[PDB]
Amino acid sequence: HHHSSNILIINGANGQLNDTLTEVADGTLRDLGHDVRIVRADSDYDVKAEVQNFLWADVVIWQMPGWWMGAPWTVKKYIDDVFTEGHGTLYASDGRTKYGSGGLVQGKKYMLSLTWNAPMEAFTEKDQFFHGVGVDGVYLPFHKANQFLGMEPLPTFIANDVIKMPDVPRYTEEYRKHLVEIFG
Amino acid sequence: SSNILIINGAKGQLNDTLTEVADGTLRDLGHDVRIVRADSDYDVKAEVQNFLWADVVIWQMPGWWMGAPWTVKKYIDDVFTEGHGTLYASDGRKYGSGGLVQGKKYMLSLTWNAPMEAFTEKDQFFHGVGVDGVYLPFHKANQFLGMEPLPTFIANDVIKMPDVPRYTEEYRKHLVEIFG
Numbered sequence: 001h002h003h004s005s006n007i008l009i010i011n012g013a014n015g016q017l018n019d020t021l022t023e024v025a026d027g028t029l030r031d032l033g034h035d036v037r038i039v040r041a042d043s044d045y046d047v048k049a050e051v052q053n054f055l056w057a058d059v060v061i062w063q064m065p066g067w068w069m070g071a072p073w074t075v076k077k078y079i080d081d082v083f084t085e086g087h088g089t090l091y092a093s094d095g096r097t098k099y100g101s102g103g104l105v106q107g108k109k110y111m112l113s114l115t116w117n118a119p120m121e122a123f124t125e126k127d128q129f130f131h132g133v134g135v136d137g138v139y140l141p142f143h144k145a146n147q148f149l150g151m152e153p154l155p156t157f158i159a160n161d162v163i164k165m166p167d168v169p170r171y172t173e174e175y176r177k178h179l180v181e182i183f184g
Numbered sequence: 185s186s187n188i189l190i191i192n193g194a195k196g197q198l199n200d201t202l203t204e205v206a207d208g209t210l211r212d213l214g215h216d217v218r219i220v221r222a223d224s225d226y227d228v229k230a231e232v233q234n235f236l237w238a239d240v241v242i243w244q245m246p247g248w249w250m251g252a253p254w255t256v257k258k259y260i261d262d263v264f265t266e267g268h269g270t271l272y273a274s275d276g277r278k279y280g281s282g283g284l285v286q287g288k289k290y291m292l293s294l295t296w297n298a299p300m301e302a303f304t305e306k307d308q309f310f311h312g313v314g315v316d317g318v319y320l321p322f323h324k325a326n327q328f329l330g331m332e333p334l335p336t337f338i339a340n341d342v343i344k345m346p347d348v349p350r351y352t353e354e355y356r357k358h359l360v361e362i363f364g
Contacts, residue, residue, distance in 0.1 A: 073258035100309030129280035
């Protein structure tokens with residue numbers, strides 16, 4: 001079910017930084033020749049229309065803040081609503097007829113763009129809170145929800161200490177170079 | 185004799201059934217039990233008071249798209265946040281050391297479609313990180329408050345292999361082993 005690229009940015013949007021980074025990606029990517037659509041997870045979306053957005057998309061970008069160690073409930077509701085709908089388009093089942101091999105959109109990719117209060121050391125230091133599993137380790141279940149559909153991950157981007165050490169200029173440029181590197 | 189709070193994430197008769205099993209078993213062991221349905225119009229202040237009352241919090245829930253149903257995550261986002269000043273003070277500034285309810289315990293009781301092998305084999309979907317690995321973020325949200333984990337219970341292949349009974353007996357046994 002997977003056929004420049006079509007990019008779908010899901011804005012999980014302090015609701016300024018995420019709105020700002022959504023805009024940065026929108027402009028950067030469109031100036032690199034891609035076509036992008038932006039959808040706010042915290043909106044009264046049309047699930048069937050959202051399924052079609054995923055079918056249209058070559059890449060899905062999840063721009064979102066870390067809320068209680070993961071996606072805000074509105075983003076998880078978008079997944080629970082949209083992914084479940086789409087059964088038959090985005091995925092057929094869990095694969096068994098190895099769990100996780102029943103997706104129908106292999107070839108599509110997704111990327112996480114995050115903003116957290118926690119410092120990076122909290123993710124990397126074996127002796128700290130997340131026991132060194134890393135940002136992607138903390139997001140394993142989120143990555144896997146996307147992979148169940150058959151999509152592949154692209155390098156994660158994350159801004160840390162956004163509240164205790166804010167610096168939009170830094171984040172914005174770093175994100176831009178992150179995008180140019182991947183989508184350039 | 186502990187106060188146990190059970191958050192029923194059913195959205196979903198199996199989880200309703202397992203909530204009942206926990207309630208009946210724990211009370212029979214001398215504990216007081218309270219049940220709250222995550223998928224309801226709960227009052228955030230009331231829930232914070234449930235947490236302060238509880239010695240142990242059991243999260244009974246099905247796995248939805250690799251984790252907690254959105255209604256359970258909204259429960260956390262709503263209640264844990266209202267809990268600022270009672271359940272947690274700050275992020276501790278290392279990060280995660282700013283809880284206010286150290287001494288309390290929490291436990292995950294899960295129901296999944298996937299088979300246990302999908303969690304333990306390094307070459308499978310979950311590269312062998314285990315059930316608790318997949319739930320790392322959920323465990324950590326609880327630990328941020330200062331609470332400590334108890335052994336996780338999980339019923340696998342609950343849809344492809346409806347073994348109710350079996351799941352009820354194993355959970356019942358799991359509970360006696362921990363709270364007995």
